[PDB]
Amino acid sequence: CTMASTKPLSRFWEWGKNIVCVGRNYTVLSEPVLFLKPSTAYAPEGSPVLMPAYCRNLHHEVELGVLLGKRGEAIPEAAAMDYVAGYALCLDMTARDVQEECKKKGLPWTLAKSFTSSCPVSAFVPKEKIPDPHALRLWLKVNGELRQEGKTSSMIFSIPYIISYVSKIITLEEGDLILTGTPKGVGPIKENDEIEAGIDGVVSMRFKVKRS
Amino acid sequence: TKPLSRFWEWGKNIVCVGRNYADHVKVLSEPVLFLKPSTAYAPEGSPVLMPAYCRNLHHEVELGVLLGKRGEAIPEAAAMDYVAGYALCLDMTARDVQEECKKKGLPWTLAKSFTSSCPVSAFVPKEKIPDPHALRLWLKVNGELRQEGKTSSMIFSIPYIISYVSKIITLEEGDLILTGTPKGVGPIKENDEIEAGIDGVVSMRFKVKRS
Ligand SMILES: [Cl-]
Ligand SMILES: [Cl-]
Ligand SMILES: [Cl-]
Ligand SMILES: [Mg+2]
Ligand SMILES: [Mg+2]
Ligand SMILES: [Mg+2]
């Protein structure tokens, strides 16, 4: 089978190897902060967000995800958008107190950012549906109440810039995903809370928060 | 197909422990964990590529544990049933960048997770290693011994590490865990030749090249 019974972009979470996330993109450094999630962070719509046992302060971060359509090694910024298959709406689910400890102790962010279900993900949005990734409204509601809204025009580092920089450090494979940061309004969730989030005019998704 | 013999071709995730050897310093706190991407794999035949930004590249010879099976919250007593086998690995580290990451309280990504940051030997089936904690690892640079140590010097056992990791991160078929480096970590420069092995089991050669 030489088809999309092999690498279907509509199911990128099933076969995608790597997830790369930018830090503060809405002190900021000369470059975007980068951290990884494992493939097993993916929570496709229908999956709950799982509060880890060790987690006291679970935070939502609505983020635009950029899906790579082809292998990219030191991708030029001017070519970067030729490497994009499309987008997903994502949550960068964060154990915020663990993260405070990680920052303070100079440890890796893995227990804060990389747990099971730490990357809820919408249906695949083909590139065609988004003329301009930097002209979108991201929104997130908890129990029907708006908590984050932000414009992707507010991004400090552009998506072509991010793809380029990341690919110079980490070769990206077909189906790798880059989370491009969260606007203002990040905040906590508790067991049995309902998250709704969307990109205006493009896609919405629902997640319930549960425990292990 | 997805042969475990070629796990680097298709494996999704690499998890690495911090310091797990009691034979050097460069109520026990849990093991530090960090991730490498799939594109960290440098299978034998690949060179190690020094990132442009790197001033102080370090070798870390490590025993890699390959998972055969999906595992969530694996009990320590069951952990070894999830192991398909082993690989000899290098946890290639930009040491100065790591100091910068620690100082700012940022992720260790640029220090630990670059392209080719995980050189990897031929797959060793579990059968060939009755006791993972009774192995000698060694590494030479340009013919000169730099690291040697026993996996009996590990602070946390392999079943412990698999268990702890799986409670935080579900492991897939083909995921790899690097279990730490013995004494002798140190720098390597462009055009250095690395030889490393597990006594009685496997050896590997790598050349270090630049951008
Ligand atoms: Cl927390
Ligand atoms: Cl360095
Ligand atoms: Cl990290
Ligand atoms: Mg984030
Ligand atoms: Mg991965
Ligand atoms: Mg190591």
Reduced 3-state DSSP string for chain A: CCCCCCCCHHHHHHHCCCEEEECCCCCCCCCCCEEEECHHHEEEECECEEECCCCCCEEECEEEEEEECCCECCCCCCCHHHHEEEEEEEECCEEHHHHHHHHHHCCCCHHHHCCCCCEEECCCEEHHHCCCCCCCEEEEEECCEEEEEEEHHHCCCCHHHHHHHHHHHCCECCCCEEECCCCCCCEECCCCCEEEEEECCCEEEEEEEEEC
E strand or H helix at B101, and its extent?
Answer: helix B95-104
- Determine contact: A24 vs chain B, CB below 8 A: no
Q: Is A61 annotated as a binding residue?
A: yes
| Nearest ligand by distance to the CA of A59 | 1
CA-CA distances (angstroms) from residue B77 to B80, B157, B160, B162?
Answer: 8, 11, 9, 10
- Yes or no: say if B70 and A146 are a contact pair by the CB < 8 Å rule: no
What is the residue whose two structure tokens read 């310093």? B25
Distance from the Cα of residue B51 to its chain's centroid:
18
To the nearest whole Å, the CA of A1 is away from the closest chain B CA by 12
Among A109, A165, A211, the strongest candidate for a mutation testing the B interface, having the largest count of B CBs within 10 A, is A109
Chain breaks in chain A (C to N over 2.5 A) after: 26
DSSP B13: -
Domains observed in chain A: 1-212 (3.90.850.10)
Integer-rounded Cα Rg, in Å, for chain A is 16
- Yes or no: say if B92 and B119 are a contact pair by the CB < 8 Å rule: yes
Which tokens is A160 given?
């072509």
The whole-angstrom separation of Cα B46 and Cα A167 is 18
- Yes or no: say if A125 and A177 are a contact pair by the CB < 8 Å rule: no
In sequence order, the β-bridge partners of residue B85 are B66, B125
The whole-angstrom separation of Cα A172 and Cα A66 is 11
CB contact under 8 A, A111 and B33: yes
- Determine contact: A208 vs chain B, CB below 8 A: no
> What does the angle CA A75 – CA A78 – CA A84 come to, to the nearest 5 degrees?
60
| Number of Cα atoms under 13 Å in the Cβ half of residue B37 | 29
Nearest to A85 by CA among A150, A15, A157, A181: A15
Please tell me the distance between residue A96's alpha carbon and the centre of ligand 1 in angstroms.
Answer: 5
**CB contact set of B37 (below 8 Å; sequence gap of 6+):** A17, A18, A20, A36, A170, A171, A176, B14, B113
CB contact under 8 A, A115 and B168: yes
To the nearest whole Å, the CA of A200 is away from the closest chain B CA by 32
Side chain identity at B171, as an amino acid letter?
Answer: L
β-pairing, B124-125 with B83-90?
Answer: antiparallel
Nearest to A118 by CA among A65, A178, A188, A43: A43
E strand or H helix at B35, and its extent?
Answer: strand B33-36
The whole-angstrom separation of Cα B207 and Cα B211 is 13
- Yes or no: say if A199 and A138 are a contact pair by the CB < 8 Å rule: yes
User: Which residue on chain A is closest to B72 by alpha carbon?
Assistant: A116
> What does the angle CA B171 – CA B176 – CA B181 come to, to the nearest 5 degrees?
130
The whole-angstrom separation of Cα B17 and Cα B34 is 7
Nearest to A183 by CA among A61, A99, A94: A61
Assign residue A162 a region: left if phi > 0, alpha if psi is -120 to 50, beta otherwise? Answer: alpha
Nearest to B88 by CA among B149, B170, B3, B19: B149
To the nearest whole Å, the CA of A172 is away from the closest chain B CA by 7
Structure method = X-ray
- Yes or no: say if B97 and B70 are a contact pair by the CB < 8 Å rule: no
User: How many residue pairs bridge chain A and chain B with CB atoms within 8 Å of each other?
Assistant: 105
Nearest to B12 by CA among B136, B151, B173, B133: B173
Nearest to A169 among B110, B167, B175 (CB): B110
β-pairing, B33-36 with B118-120?
Answer: unpaired
Nearest to B105 among A52, A103, A173 (CB): A103
Assign residue B73 a region: left if phi > 0, alpha if psi is -120 to 50, beta otherwise? Answer: left
CA-CA distances (angstroms) from residue B109 to A153, B68, B98?
Answer: 26, 26, 9
Which tokens is A92 given?
């960068």
CA-CA distances (angstroms) from residue A61 to A101, A113, A189, B70?
Answer: 19, 11, 11, 28
To the nearest whole Å, the CA of B199 is away from the closest chain A CA by 32
Side chain identity at B159, as an amino acid letter?
Answer: P
The whole-angstrom separation of Cα A138 and Cα A149 is 6
Entry resolution (Å): 2.2
Q: For B152-168, give one letter per residue: b (16+ CB within 10 A) or e.
A: ebbbbbbbbbbbbbbbb
Burial class (CB in 10 A: 0-12, 13-18, 19+), B22: middle
Sign of the alpha-carbon torsion through A26, A112, A37, B38: positive
Nearest to B165 by CA among B15, B40, B18: B15
What is the residue whose two structure tokens read 């949005």? A125
What is the residue whose two structure tokens read 């709950």? A48
CB contact under 8 A, A169 and B105: no
User: Residue B115: its chain A contacts at CB < 8 A?
Assistant: 73, 169-171
Calculate the CA dihedral of residues B41, A118, A131, A200 and round it to 10 degrees: 180
What is the residue whose two structure tokens read 């494996």? B11
The whole-angstrom separation of Cα B125 and Cα B139 is 21
DSSP B156: S
- Determine contact: A107 vs chain B, CB below 8 A: yes
